Amino acid sequence: SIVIASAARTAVGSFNGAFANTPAHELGATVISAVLERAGVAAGEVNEVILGQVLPAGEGQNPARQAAMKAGVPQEATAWGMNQLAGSGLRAVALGMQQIATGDASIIVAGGMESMSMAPHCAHLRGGVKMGDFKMIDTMIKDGLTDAFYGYHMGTTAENVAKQWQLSRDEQDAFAVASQNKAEAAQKDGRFKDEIVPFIVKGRKGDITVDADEYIRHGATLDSMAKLRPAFDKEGTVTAGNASGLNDGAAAALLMSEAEASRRGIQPLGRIVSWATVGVDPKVMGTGPIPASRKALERAGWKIGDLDLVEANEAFAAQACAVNKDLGWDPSIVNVNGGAIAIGHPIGASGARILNTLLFEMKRRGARKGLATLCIGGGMGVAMCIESL
Amino acid sequence: SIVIASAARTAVGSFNGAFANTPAHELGATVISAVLERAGVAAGEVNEVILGQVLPAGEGQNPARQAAMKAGVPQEATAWGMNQLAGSGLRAVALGMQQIATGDASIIVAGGMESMSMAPHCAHLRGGVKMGDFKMIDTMIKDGLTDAFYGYHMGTTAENVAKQWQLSRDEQDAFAVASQNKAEAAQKDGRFKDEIVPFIVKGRKGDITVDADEYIRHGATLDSMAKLRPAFDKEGTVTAGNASGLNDGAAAALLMSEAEASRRGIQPLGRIVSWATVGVDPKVMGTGPIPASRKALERAGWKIGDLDLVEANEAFAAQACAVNKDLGWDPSIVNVNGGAIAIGHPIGASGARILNTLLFEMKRRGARKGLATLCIGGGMGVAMCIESL
Amino acid sequence: SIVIASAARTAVGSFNGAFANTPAHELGATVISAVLERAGVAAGEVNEVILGQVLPAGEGQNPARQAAMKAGVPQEATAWGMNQLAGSGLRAVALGMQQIATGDASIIVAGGMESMSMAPHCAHLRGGVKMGDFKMIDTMIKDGLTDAFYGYHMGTTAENVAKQWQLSRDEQDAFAVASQNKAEAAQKDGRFKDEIVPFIVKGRKGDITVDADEYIRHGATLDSMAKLRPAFDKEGTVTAGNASGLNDGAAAALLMSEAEASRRGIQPLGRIVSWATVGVDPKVMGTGPIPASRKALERAGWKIGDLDLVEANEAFAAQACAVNKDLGWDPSIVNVNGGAIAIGHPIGASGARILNTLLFEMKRRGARKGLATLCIGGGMGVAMCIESL
Amino acid sequence: SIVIASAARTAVGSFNGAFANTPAHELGATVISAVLERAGVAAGEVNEVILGQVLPAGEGQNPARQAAMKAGVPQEATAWGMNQLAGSGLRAVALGMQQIATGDASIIVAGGMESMSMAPHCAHLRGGVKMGDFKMIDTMIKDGLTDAFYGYHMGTTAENVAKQWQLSRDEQDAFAVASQNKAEAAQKDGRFKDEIVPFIVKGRKGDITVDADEYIRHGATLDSMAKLRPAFDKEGTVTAGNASGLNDGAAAALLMSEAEASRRGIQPLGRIVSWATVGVDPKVMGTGPIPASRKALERAGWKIGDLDLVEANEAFAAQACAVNKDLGWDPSIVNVNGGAIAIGHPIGASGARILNTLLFEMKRRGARKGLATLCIGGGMGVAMCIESL
Ligand SMILES: CC(C)(COP(=O)(O)OP(=O)(O)OC[C@H]1O[C@@H](n2cnc3c(N)ncnc32)[C@H](O)[C@@H]1OP(=O)(O)O)[C@@H](O)C(=O)NCCC(=O)NCCS
Ligand SMILES: CC(C)(COP(=O)(O)OP(=O)(O)OC[C@H]1O[C@@H](n2cnc3c(N)ncnc32)[C@H](O)[C@@H]1OP(=O)(O)O)[C@@H](O)C(=O)NCCC(=O)NCCS
Ligand SMILES: CC(C)(COP(=O)(O)OP(=O)(O)OC[C@H]1O[C@@H](n2cnc3c(N)ncnc32)[C@H](O)[C@@H]1OP(=O)(O)O)[C@@H](O)C(=O)NCCC(=O)NCCS
Ligand SMILES: CC(C)(COP(=O)(O)OP(=O)(O)OC[C@H]1O[C@@H](n2cnc3c(N)ncnc32)[C@H](O)[C@@H]1OP(=O)(O)O)[C@@H](O)C(=O)NCCC(=O)NCCS
């Protein structure tokens, strides 16, 4: 019915790294441009651009429209942003599918983008501070990483899952080190080459082309993982090593109907067979993928064992281990090229980021059935089922 | 197929007025609670809440979810926010409809919420300011009201439309005054009573219940409109009097299928027969409703003359006049109870706000066919067609 | 040897009151102009302007020079600012005296100015805040009212003196009320008329002439004083009522040698017979005046009983009582026209402010010997002995 | 009469370099401790500390007292800061000399300190910003480097002096290069070793001892100088190369009477024979040293040809050349060990900084008569004559 014709992502940048001063929409325009090129679709044929973005403060009116216009998508098209936290990037794709499914659009570019680096500090000053000190608020932490109900960082929700599922520091570290090793191997063997489009960081004393995931550490040791101090609980288990990072990037997919791709002679990256989103307790939001993946599979008519490949986002080693444990899918088909502990976690973009990695690995090993899933702050999960054509 | 079972909205607050220190999600919870109570639907039955919001900076993770959970919608449900600027509140509804149409939900609460009063000032300070002054940026102006492609206020786009359509200061002021006069008459006659749910502003030296639109001026004279200076062009035509204001409010609709409503014994407020969104030049974005409405009616199979009632959002008198002039619908069926010049423009809520006004007027006078439309910053428009059951 | 030929001050403004948006140098220029006029001395004859100022942040290069130049003091003369906190205003006069005594200058305009209202908030941001919230620092608190060695407000140092000297809440309130009643009586009787020069607050919809001390409250009851909550210690004795306020204002004196005034036919306000400055424990800085006055009286060769009039700055009721109690001078000859609890406490200007009060009262009642003294943050005191000619 | 018993300074740190995060008073406390040690005077014996500081915003109450107390000067001594911009450090010494000459003190530590790196950005926010963007004001530029009468940088005042004195780009560059070469030669020859006391920059992953001037560039070519673009006038002559920098540091001298050094068996670095300060046009403030030095020499009863050594502060190549040209002293005896273009310009400290350089060179070559002078923003200059014993 609805297919993914082409996809593309920027490299994921380190916090205040390669893309430290690059607005999100600049990354999404590059990505929008890339999916057009890959599909053989002209920007004039695009009906709407949908881009997940959790932290747009300061970047001006509707950055999704800014991206679309910059990529040369005509003014006649539309664009909008949405926010389901780390779910955003993938949810945008499901949302883009529904446009075509209900007959309101034919061609949709959908994904996510995020510049955690460029997120500003803020304060509400309209009423005026009569007297005393006031906080300038880091919008990345406030609006991206803090739970609104319990007031703690997502890492504390990772601790909740760890205790509940009795996951040791050592077990979380092994998972972490493994993510790094798989991603380093993938990177060196060229397996991110297909999915990555280069990004030119414009300069004044020179332009810089970034075409590699810079957050991936080389020769990651178990020792140096075990040496780290707990990051959120001074007698806790979750660390800066076994948690994902703060990162920048964008990622997208071009969607159309299966019959339309056939007319164009496009050979799609996959067909979207189903998706699902479900809520869980905020305190254990890392478990979101469990009901969300089960639901998606149920909608697809698939057994857990039918999946040949899986991308389950690594917000924290604690949560990823829990999800794998409960769902019980073959861990060897999961995050085959590493995950967000190594690659990075650009919130609004990660859902589309991990879709890209799924799609291109599926194609390269000739996998038929895949699933992509992410946990989401405030207690949600999202999943999507993809089949090869 | 898809019906609006119930709807509700807060009063619209004046900038730094009654809701000066009320977070947007607090207004959306009230609104969510009200649509549930009006439809005879319990919170536990809601699958997902979808709330438009352009300015959530500083408010924490996913305000849509905060709204939902405060209304007692269970943690198993999902929630997300979205931004198509002024289109957001109505687009959220069309997006809710599609969840049910594609069979992914049964019961959606959709609309918009906005606290322009509580929007913070900000600055990107990670790299640091080595030397020299920097700007603290008002996010309301930056992310709400400024065009990203030309750098000027929406008021300027309103200037652009006035010149293109040769609309005098005097004609714009006549419209402005009429809007106020219709809105005051409606207010005093009690015509907003049906659609408004009261909001309790919590206190410390006293709670305050707000159930009237406080931005509406009483005894608005033409004289006092004509005495105002131009706001965006010191030799211009647009003024604070003939533009919409800066405001606070939330508004929503509870969606389900027509067959579901029937099972429940609900008499819906209307059936969504169609919606549309289309792009126009950023410089003349006020003209967005023209193609968007024409498309929506084409999709509904309706003639312009088939509409019995119309809500066309008054972002500025210049654009509203241009929209009416081009579409040529009977201006006496348009904004019958007044519009945003009088009522106010809480950006991300406005589209569900004017849906509410359409729906309760349609019901009270027995109108069969209605249409709602808004212009959108950066050159877009959105429209939705509604028919009574 | 060295005489005060003339003197003048602005009225003392309330915090964010009449001088809410008035830079300090503007107040200082008015005061400079006033002392010239009163002495019959042309600006061109001035050698140097010395102005005390604790909170010049944001106002631009050397506000003392700005004040001098705007008062039409020629570009040949010199000007500088200096900081000994609350002792700055009176210290400037002593420093100006030394300029003439060492033979480096003939004519000096010395005093102090302060705009606590215009003091900005700040943050060091060159390094750049990589991540997390940061504080914007109210420089009035940080640089004006916080102890550098123990990190607490000057009201804590008043709490220290209160416990040490066993001064009750009731005793401090009796002193506070008395200061208000003496100041209101003086004001209505026109005893501040001679010292005050009016300041014109430039406006856009109208100019405003301020020539009365606005911080003096009329009909100050003991009841309303006793109803106030402790300000710095939630089981303490110091309050907003029995402490001085945050205030704006400027004050100065014109200095020359005794023989110079005689040549010019000027009848001076007083001769500077001596001065002194001494340190005490930071924790009990309010006690500064004790050693500083005893030193000054030793240098002047005076007994404490020789003083006919005294101005002992009321930073806090607790400290002012302690100073009076130790020194044991007649409390009826101290702060005859009230003090800073009623009049206000513009840190940099206060020293010269109370000098003016001392001088014009000395003249009107014909007092021969006078003394002015102030406690200084960080544990210091300053005093000056004056004799009429 | 009054002698400089000892002297010391920190190295001068580059902008955001070695002292990037070091509060000024910390550098002052080191310099206070140094001069005590060198003179063989105990901290207990000091009466008062005088420290010039132009940019103390954010550092708390009276940093002069913070320095004195950290250096172990007892709470019975007094301490204050002053501001005559670049003239402050040397003026402090003069002011300290007068304390002893007027009999109010015996032993004074006087000089200057500045952390231009630690100067914060600020904004007046009491009134509160109703709407729109507002500037965060860099207090370094605003209070340090901007003219309060004409509103342009000090580099523009240098442009005025250049045009006025017809000083070419090539002449200014030849002076700049020479300053860098003389300083580098002096550095390698160990001529700054005597005056410099090391500063320990406290750390967390290690302490760092700074004891060399880091702003001095090695191998300064005329080519690289001439390649630079104009800094303040896009068709101008002043550059970052031929102007002094933005720096951090501190410097002081211990003052006592001549007979007091003789009692103590101290051989002073010099006797302060005279000082002087005079104003000029703000537009051409760089000419300040001219009248100020001519006045000082007239007070000292010296001819310009009697001077054996001179320190004339190099704020800008343009002004320095003009001063040298007018006064016509032998340029080979001026800034023998280089100047501020090479060594750096920590505004408040420079006046005490160059005093040190003057003194320790006078001792090492056996010069009898010496002079120090600095231009001062807003059109002033200061100068002091020193004679060896
Ligand atoms: C955990 C977190 C707070 C850490 O932030 P941080 O302290 O600034 O990160 P840093 O890398 O600077 O600090 C960790 C230290 O451990 C080291 N480190 C990090 N990963 C390591 C690894 N895998 N092996 C060895 N050392 C490692 C770093 O080098 C650093 O030390 P250094 O500064 O000397 O180099 C942050 O990454 C985070 O909040 N991530 C979670 C995001 C999230 O919640 N996502 C949303 C959920 S869907
Ligand atoms: C126009 C706008 C900038 C307000 O500017 P402002 O001058 O700062 O606001 P004010 O209300 O104070 O305007 C000035 C005066 O107009 C007066 N005024 C406004 N409406 C009036 C009325 N109809 N009758 C008489 N006077 C009126 C106000 O009372 C005010 O009086 P004052 O000067 O004594 O305070 C703001 O309302 C706006 O930009 N809204 C546009 C909405 C928008 O861009 N929406 C997005 C597009 S979809
Ligand atoms: C103590 C301090 C925080 C109080 O300032 P503030 O809280 O902004 O003052 P407020 O207006 O909020 O005072 C609260 C109330 O107390 C009342 N109050 C204060 N002084 C009063 C008095 N003299 N008599 C009766 N009522 C009084 C006010 O009317 C006010 O009423 P409101 O809250 O309804 O407006 C402030 O003045 C301070 O830091 N003191 C400076 C003392 C000082 O150190 N001076 C320099 C020497 S080192
Ligand atoms: C002129 C001034 C504004 C320059 O500030 P700046 O723009 O930050 O200058 P920079 O340090 O960035 O210089 C730019 C580059 O030129 C080079 N350059 C500067 N001076 C040079 C010189 N002396 N020789 C060779 N190259 C030089 C530097 O290597 C620097 O390299 P970068 O690319 O890594 O930055 C600053 O020095 C200033 O405000 N002057 C102080 C004078 C003043 O007003 N103080 C009080 C006077 S009374």
Curated annotation (Swiss-Prot), chains A, B, C, D:
GO terms for biological process: poly-hydroxybutyrate biosynthetic process. It comes from the Bacteria. GO terms for cellular component: cytoplasm. Pfam families: Thiolase_C (PF02803), Thiolase_N (PF00108). InterPro entries: Thiolase, Thiolase-like, Thiolase_acyl_enz_int_AS, Thiolase_AS, Thiolase_C, Thiolase_CS, Thiolase_N. SUPFAM superfamilies: Thiolase-like. Belongs to the thiolase-like superfamily. Thiolase family. This is Acetyl-CoA acetyltransferase. It comes from Shinella zoogloeoides (Crabtreella saccharophila). The lineage of its organism: Bacteria, Pseudomonadati, Pseudomonadota, Alphaproteobacteria, Hyphomicrobiales. The gene is phaA.
